[model samples]
Target chain A: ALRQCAIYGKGGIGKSTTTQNLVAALAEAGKKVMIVGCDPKADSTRLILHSKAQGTVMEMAASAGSVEDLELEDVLQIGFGGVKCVESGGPEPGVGCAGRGVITAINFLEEEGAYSDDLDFVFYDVLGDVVCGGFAMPIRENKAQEIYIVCSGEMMAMYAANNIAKGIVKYAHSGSVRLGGLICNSRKTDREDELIMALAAKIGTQMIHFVPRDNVVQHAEIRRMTVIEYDPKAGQADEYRALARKIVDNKLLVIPNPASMEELEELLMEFGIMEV
Target chain B: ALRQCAIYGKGGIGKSTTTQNLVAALAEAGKKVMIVGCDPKADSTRLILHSKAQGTVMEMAASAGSVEDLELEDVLQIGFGGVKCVESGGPEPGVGCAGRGVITAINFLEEEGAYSDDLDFVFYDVLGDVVCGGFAMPIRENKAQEIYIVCSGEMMAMYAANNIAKGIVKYAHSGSVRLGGLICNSRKTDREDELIMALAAKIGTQMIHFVPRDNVVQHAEIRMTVIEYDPKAGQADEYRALARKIVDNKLLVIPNPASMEELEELLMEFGIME
Candidate 1:
């Protein structure tokens, strides 16, 4: 029985790395995990696969003309820690929409029967910003009940977090998807941990974990591995281990009161992300 | 008064060149005219402008960070035969919608008083299929009432024509954007002219002009002058005649049924294009 989770953030926010490292820590704790990378960029499952690029559903379907012509095995692959990996790829930039590819890929996954009975957790590493139709496939009805947003104390990062929440609010009204918590990947900003925690409180969600900025994680990433994989004994690995433990024991799921731009600005002013 | 006619078609069909040659013919007849390329591609007024591209409203507005900062002169350019030219630009292909660009540009045109009372005709050469809110800007209330679809005997083209008709049906019920006629830019299939005529009849409109296939227009396209590039050319003269007729004509029809299957059958009759 896999507990489904989705991670969302703005582009270039290190959402993929944070998701992969956290999932790797869960694997280290002896929990079965699967990572689904739902981005056209197809970097979501990279660290888990330890492969340069995983074969995406959209990439294969493009050659075959449509996902209707695809096989489940053509897209899904089992990677590190026996965690299944699937990446829903999209068209090249400036052609057909990448978002539509997300929709087609998820439907293909459902039809292909990728979700099996023997699973402890399924994590979706979604693209930054739920801009359109396809990126929303994971949060739609009866899927990805728990959503964790990876953010920092940066102003744009908070804006991205709130925008992702707005996208969730659209589906939360009808679906099981709820804000599980926020994973603050620290930027070493002044009062970084307290800022994210207070912002999370304002949005009616908890700061699930404050994974501090650590050189050890960067050191491990140079070798193309999550901190949990490259250096499982490192001090940074402990942060992921704690994050894994928190999520494993976590039951705090609520449809978040996504803030308005004004409300977010108000929070930013308090945190000094904006001038008071 | 210059009658402003906006001809909208689905993307990739012959809306631009058709509107251009038609406007060229109007210019030859000494009627004051202008062509506004309402597509994001901004190629609509290229044949008229004789320039590579006209500066679009959106492109200029974005460069200035707001439309309010743009002068009417920046977006509007002078083109062939003293025909005023303007292009309503669109957004980047995937980042944002190109359709909404048309709406904003048209609104900008109205606000800036670009439509001069002295002009006799202003033709909006719209882009391919009016898929969303952005492309439908020209067909809205108090805009172009006369719409001429540039279509041929191709199946997909016919489907697009029908869909445009359905769009017109919705607007016609509420406003005055009526289906004027079909201007068939022929592929010279065995029965393209007759089939388009039948399709036009089925849609409660007429086959207004059957502009036959000619390499002469393509030759003139490079020269940027329709008749000046080839005055005696039959195709060029045909466009001249079509323009005159449209100037004198009084046909603004509310489109009839635009069925998919009937259009499919029309395409089957022409074996050249599926």
Candidate 2:
């Protein structure tokens, strides 16, 4: 059975980087994995695929006149450590609904059996914020049953994580989806790990893993490859491998209780991130 | 050239009733007139046509695949005294954009030559406030140049009229459209005529007509129109006089709407409110 998971965070918070590296680590552990990139920018699979941007399901669907015309292998590409990659591409800015494109591509993937029985894990790297129903597609029923949010100790990152938690709680009450944990992609802030731990505790979840700041991730990114694939012996690769092991054995999934804006500020004040 | 006019006011302010009656009077005076009902409710032409809501342009366009597939005569209904009526119908309740329907229907009428050279008057009996661009279509360029607001001395009615005047000033600044006057549909409030006249003067317009409270209007409405069913009634004569005044009236200017406090003071001075 596939362990379907979704990673969400504010834009530029290392959500895609963390997700691809973790999926790469899982692939190295001899587990069959798939990464479904649900963003209009379509940069989610670059690190894993060792390319700029993979040919997305939407692009193929548009050219073929319909999504049903394309075969499973048409949009799917095998990336680092034999991990599958597919992107739900969308329209350019100020045009048609990009959110609708996400819905259409995800629906196409499901109907085409993208979540095959042989796969051990399926990771959905979605765009930031649950702005609309189309962006919230992964958390819907029978999709991603577990959700992980990548955040930093920065104020806005925590605020966005809380807001995303609120969105998850809405779906959690109606579906099997729950907050797996908060993955802290360190911004090198003072006591960043402690701050994220407090946030996760308040939201009734755990800080799954705290991957410290590393320049090797960016070096791998420039090569359009993940840290695990670029340098298998790199310290960053071990960090992702440890995170991936924890996720493989992760059992704690709970409906999150998001904090009030004032409550979050109070925590930030306590941590001295915000001046009293 | 058509003397294009648009009647605007709060919802349920008797704008449609006043417009249809005035249009009927103009038709009776041997003037060619058409009433374009710009509302989703599609009740704007019921009184003029003496029928349960006429077949609207939007509904016909939607059913016939497109508005281009419909002819002017298919949507245009000849009513009392040779008056033409066309309603811009819209989506039922909550599904689609009603305002867009008004724009589509009106554009269809224009491109299809419904605004003929023989027409003497074209009255656009619009729906509520200028909440969106679609509802404001009637007052746009080449449409209704003269605008009359049907209102009462009531506070909300005056407030709505003032807000509508603000909307007019936006278009009037760049277009030829102007506030012709206010038509006071009496609600029998204390000193109603004086209060309405004060509101009119404050808004840089005039109280063009003070239509009194009469059960005769309801009586005429039961049969669809006062001009057609009760031409001998005093209310029907009032409409004829209003139509005549409208014909000769030339005062058109961008209104300087009064502030909330100013309108309230005027209302209090007339003893219409505490």
Candidate 3:
């Protein structure tokens, strides 16, 4: 049975970095993993592949002049720690929608049998914000069964999480996808942990991991690698290991409580995000 | 009794220029007028306002924070020839949806009583390709009653016209909006008028006006006013006559033969565009 999960968050919130490091830790624990980088930015598997980009279904389709004709070998690529990787490259500036790129790539992979029967986990590093229909690819039926929103205490991050929960409400009632939890990539905001916990609580989810602001992530990013891969004995590596254990043990899938603009404002005010 | 008419067409076929010049002609005929530029680019009233842009409802709303805080005066602006003007601006760059901007602005206008009892007409100059929900702002229920699609011999323009007709067919079944006719902006292309006539015939609408490709429109744009900038010009008088004709015309309709795919195939047959 395939165990798939997608990680979503606002852009520039260390979502891809967190996913890569966590997936690396999962691999270290002897779990068979596949990382599908669903963003057109294609940085989802850069750390895993140690390459600029894994061949994407879209890029291959583009090379052949449209997705109507492309093969499996042209898109899928394997990387370090035996992790399979793929990126869904998108259109040039002001062209077709980027979200459609995610949908097309995922469909291509599914049609071409990219998923191995023996795979233990498939991680979708999705585009930030889940603003449109295309970015919701991870939550489609028989796809990512769990969704983790990478967020922090910032107002924009919380707004993104709440918006994502609303998107989940669209799919959760019909599919197996559920609000797995919130993974806090701390931004050193005042009461960051408490604020995230409350935000998660409002959305009917929990703060599954509260990763502190660490220099090791930045250090590993400089070399285009995950912290766990770069220095397995590092403290940050242990943090990811703990996160992986949580993922392995996670069971609660919830129909998330998405907040309205007023409700979100109240939560933010409660955490001092907006002063009365 | 106010009679609002919305003119739509593919981008680059001169819908705004045509609508504004026509409205200016209407004003010359002493009909009270207002032009609501539903486009995100907000060029609907540039010619009438004599300025680059009249402040749109969306721009005002965004500046004041949310669209909810926008008041009537914040969005509406009066322009030359006593014609009222407004545009719907949107987010600057690759950000929020432009269609949502149109929705917000129109909703703001409706709530604020921008539509007055004395207003004679409201012309909506929508953006290119009404493939989404945004450009359908005009011609919706209890709004603009007559709809005119600007078209030409050009393949892409005709395609856009047909696609818009398809969109109209969707709303026509449920709402009061109807396809009035086709405004043929002449392209000087070989058999241009004939091709548009054929398209009009295929789509089951009349080619309302045959405004030839003229240098006067180009001449007037620099001064930001229509034939009124040079009323003595022959082409300027043509717009005036067209405006007077539309006020009395009564051929509102729900079009039947708008086929996006068929239009594409026809364009392929014509070799005018790829």
Candidate 4:
């Protein structure tokens, strides 16, 4: 059975970078993986592929007159370690309905047998904020049943993670979807990892992996490549490998108990991140 | 210009009864008047004409296939003291839109010259509760410019009156319509008249008249007449005074409808609501 999962976090919180690096590590571990980018930016697969933004399913479907007119091969691209990639691209900023584009692209992918049996894992690198029902495409029934939220010690980021957990809990009641854990993309804030771990405990989930901030991430990003592929010997590459292994053997999937605003603020104050 | 007025209140609050009797009094004062019933029940003008439910404009329009097919005289009927009456009949309960029926009937009346030049007053005896924009047809621009709310000292009655005023204030912002006054039909509540007067003052209006609780109202209603209790009767005199006051009324203004808290406080001051 395919281990379908999705990664959600606040915008600009290193979700796409962490996701591609983790996928590279999973690929290196000999797992057949696919990364479906559910963001309008289409930057999710760039690190894995070492290329500029690729042509997306929506753009191809639009040019071809409709999604039905295109073959799955037109959208699917094999990159690092044969990790398949597909981006549900959208309109430019402030123009059309980007959320609807995500829904249409995912629906087209499902109808065209993109979730093949050969795949061992399918990761939806979703947009940071679930602004509408369309952005909630990956977490809908029979899609990505395991959700991993990335966050730091930043107040807004933790707030967004709790909100996303609320969204997950809503679907979990009606479907098989569950929270896998929080992926702390360290901001190097004072006690960032400790704060995120505390949040995970209150929210009834685990701190799956705390990837330490490294300058090598920036080096690999400039080359549009994941750390594992750019320098397999790099220490940052080992961090992603450990995260990949934890996910492969993960068993702590449950409906999250998101913390209240007061509780979260209290946690922040206790961590010295907020004034008394 | 005719003093076009609309009477509004909650259901079973005696708005129709008060309106008919008041119009009858206006007619006795030698003022030409007409009553347009905007209720689906079609009972607004029954006591004036001394009959059962009259054939409404919507009924005639629906039967004849369109309102454009009917003439002004087709739905208009002459009642006591030469007051003209028309009811905007509606669909049987819960089948169609009663609000749209009101708009259609009133449009037909206007287009067919129902607002005659000789008439001194045109009173719209509206249905209980303004459910939507269609029910508010009479108070729209260029229509009824004055509104009278019939209410009692009851909590729910005052609540409905405040809500209706809120609706009127919304329209009054852009239209010529204003809150004329409150007509308190007594529920025989303790300090009922005083409570209603304070409510009217707090809401920036007046208790135009307080028609005391009367069994004679039902008595004359049974006979399909409003003045059969005799011109010498005290009940008959109350309606006469209300009619006279309405004739000389100059206190129309956009009402300062009380908030729920303020209204409940007023009711508490009267010791009727806790």
Candidate 5:
């Protein structure tokens, strides 16, 4: 069976970066992988493809008059480690539902037989921020079952992570979608591990791994390449390898018992980066 | 003529703080001001009311069994400089539209005669980050005629600012809604004034003021008070400066928002992306 997972996180919390890195590790480990960028920004595959911006399914569909005119071969671009990449470009700001564009692209991927039996994994890079209603679409549509949140120690990041948890809980019983766990792309804040692990248990899941803050990731980011592809010898690459390991072995998916705003504040009071 | 305005920006971009600070300066300048908190969080009035959380219009109405059971005196809390505060509390996550609550609150205020002719200004601290369709209700319903964006030198802040300008442009022709200006609550990034001014013009608007970043503002936040409350506040003058400009200002225009490509180019040129 295919392990269909969606990477969800607060925008600017490194969802695209972490998603691409893990998929690269998965491909290098002899597993087939596919990534669908669900946000309109369409930079999900930049590091993997070494291109500034890959052609999105929406843009291609609109340009060709309709989605029916495009070939599956035209939309799917192979990136590092032979992974498939496609982005769901969104509408112009303030016009309509960005989720509409997201749903449109995923439906196209389904009808075109993109989810072949041979594929071992398909990852959806979703923007988990409050930007539009795109947060819960992948889970609501049952496109991805295994959900991982790439969060940091920042204030807004945790707030968004908590909200996404509430979003998952809303549809958890209706569908098989579950919270796989949280991946802390650490920003080296005070007591970061203790708080995120506590936040995970608070959400009724596991803290898969704490990907530490490293300048090398920043260096690799400027080159539009994941640390694994940029310098496989770099220990930072090993961090993702270990993360990919934790994920494949993870089975503790469950319905999240999300915390209240007061409880979240309690956690902040104890181990927060804020100066008391 | 009520100088009705709405301050829109990304989440975590200090919209509430700037809104309250500027509103305080307006009230201090002998202007009758009222503010509506348009997000679910309801922290929008924290600085004004000095209470941890004020009773939201929706929340109060629900407790009273419906909106009609409540009175304007029950929902509206008068705060510093006698500024009236009310939050348009929204629905829970993954539920219905947050904009519904906003419209309900605005309608309640209107029917109750909250917009008295005696008032000089009404400010809305609105969340413009998401077009989940809820954020557009304020502009679409013709509640606020003037829109100002509080942006910084950061990438997403400016990204959100540009998107809001596009939002304003959409309703510009249909209604009286216009882009008032951009207020830079500076984070002390590289050439912030020059870059923000350039961006303001790029959007066919003005950079109203560049409120310099300071530690005093952070201290005031912890104190849960506006900079205007402190006579010794370093940033109070900036708010007063902006307040005066807004009071005497009549340069509202239909915003010409930039494309994503054009915006990215501007961000790169301004070193905001670099």
Candidate 6:
């Protein structure tokens, strides 16, 4: 059976970057992988596809008036290391349910039989905010059973993390979805690993792996390539490789124990006060 | 005629405090105002009321099993300076469209005559991303005719402000909703005032006011709005000026929204890097 997973995080949390790089590392290790971009910006696949093309399923469905007019061949494109890339485009600003677009594109993919038996893994790159129910579709129908939340020790970052945790716990018993772990992409807060680990423990999961901050990741991103693809010899590549390996073998999934806002704040206050 | 308006900003942007302070200042100037809180947590009127209440229209409506059962009196609460406060609470936690709450709450207020002519303003405090269409009901249904977006000179600040501009222009020809101006709740980025002013100019409106960053505002927020908590503070004067300018504000327009590239160029022009 394929190990399907979805990466979740607040916008501007380096979710796409971390996900693409990790997917790239998995591909490097000769794993068969596919990425479904669940963000409306359709930016989830740029590093993998380079400059972001292969028109999103929703956009194509929009032009054709329905997903019926298109074939599976038109939507999925083979990116670096044979990783399949697809994006769910969203509604125009300030109107319509943005969540519906995510669900619509998802239905198209499944119906079109994009999930091949030969694929080793399929990853849904999703924006973490649960503003509407449709954005939670991936977690709903067992499309992505393993959920990895990309977070940092920063207050806003962890707030989004814990918020996503609330949704996971709400949806867990209803579906097969499980919290795989928290992936800590370092913002270099003082004792960030410990802070994230504390949150992870509070939420009943592992820190998974702590991806340290470095200018190298940013440099690779500017070139529209993952660190694994840009500089295989770089230490960042090894970091992603380690994270990729851990994810592939990860089995410690659980119904997330979400922290209440006050409990979440208490953790932040403890660490923030001790920073000095 | 009541001059109805709304305020919108992303979460963690201090949107609620800025709005209540402005509302309080207007109340201080002896102008009647009604604040409709459109956030998920019903947190919009904390400073005005000095405490959050379970009186959100959505919650109250659900409690009574339909808005038809509740009277207008149950929803509206009088705050400091006789400012009317009502929260459009969100859908149960994390499932449905949050915007629906705003639409339903506004619908209740209208049918129940909450938009009194004696009121000088009805401010809609909203989160600006517009994840769904229901959030823009105030702009669409000829409710709030003038809109002020609370923003700063940060990355997503101008981004959301510019985005909301797109929405106004889309509904402009069909409705009376116009972009009043950008209210800069200073994030204190380098040259923030100039950058927000530049964006305001680019969008064909005024900056209106740049409320500077000060610990005094946060201090005031700990209890109530700066105007009410400490009348002698500079923030009291700042918001009073903002409130005063808004009262006679005449430069409303259908914004000429900028492209993403233009917005970023403005940031770079002010020495901010991507």
List per-model TM-scores for chain B. Answer: 0.93, 0.95, 0.91, 0.95, 0.94, 0.95
- Give candidate 6 misplaced runs (Cα > 4 Å): A52-54, A153-156, A273-276, B52-54, B267-274
lDDT of each: 0.74, 0.79, 0.74, 0.79, 0.81, 0.81
TM-score of 6: 0.91
Better of 3 and 6 by TM-score: 6
Error of 2 at B51 (Å): 56
Q: List, residue by residue over A1-276, the lDDT tens digit for candidate 5.
A: 798998988666778888898888999998899999997668898888988898888788888989888888878899899899988888766666756667778889899999988899999998776523555678776778998988876767788788777877888877888989989988767788889999898879888999887777867877889999989999989999998888889888888988987777778778846645
State what share of the real interface contacts each candidate retains.
0.00, 0.00, 0.00, 0.00, 0.40, 0.50
- TM-score per model over all chains: 0.54, 0.52, 0.55, 0.51, 0.91, 0.91
True contacts kept of 1: 0.00
Cα-based lDDT at residue B212, candidate 5: 85
- Model 6 chain A scores worst on lDDT over the 10 consecutive residues at A267-276
Candidate 2's C-alpha runs over 4 A off are B1-274
lDDT: the better of candidates 2 and 3:
2
Judged by DockQ cut-offs, the docking class of candidate 4 is incorrect
In model 1, the Cα lDDT at residue A32 comes to 83
**Model 6, docking class:** acceptable
The C-alpha stretches of model 4 lying farther than 4 A from their native spots are B1-274
True A-B contacts kept by model 2: 0.00
Q: Count the backbone clashes (under 3 Å) in each candidate.
A: 8, 0, 0, 0, 1, 0
Kindly provide the TM-score of model 3 when superposed on the true structure, using C-alpha atoms: 0.55
- What lDDT score is found at residue B53 in candidate 6? 50
Decide which is better by lDDT, 1 or 4. Answer: 4
- lDDT score of residue A188 within candidate 1: 74
lDDT score for residue B256 of model 2: 93
Model 2 per-residue lDDT tens digits across residues A46-131: 88788867878878888889877898888889878889899887753213444566787778888888878889998888765333
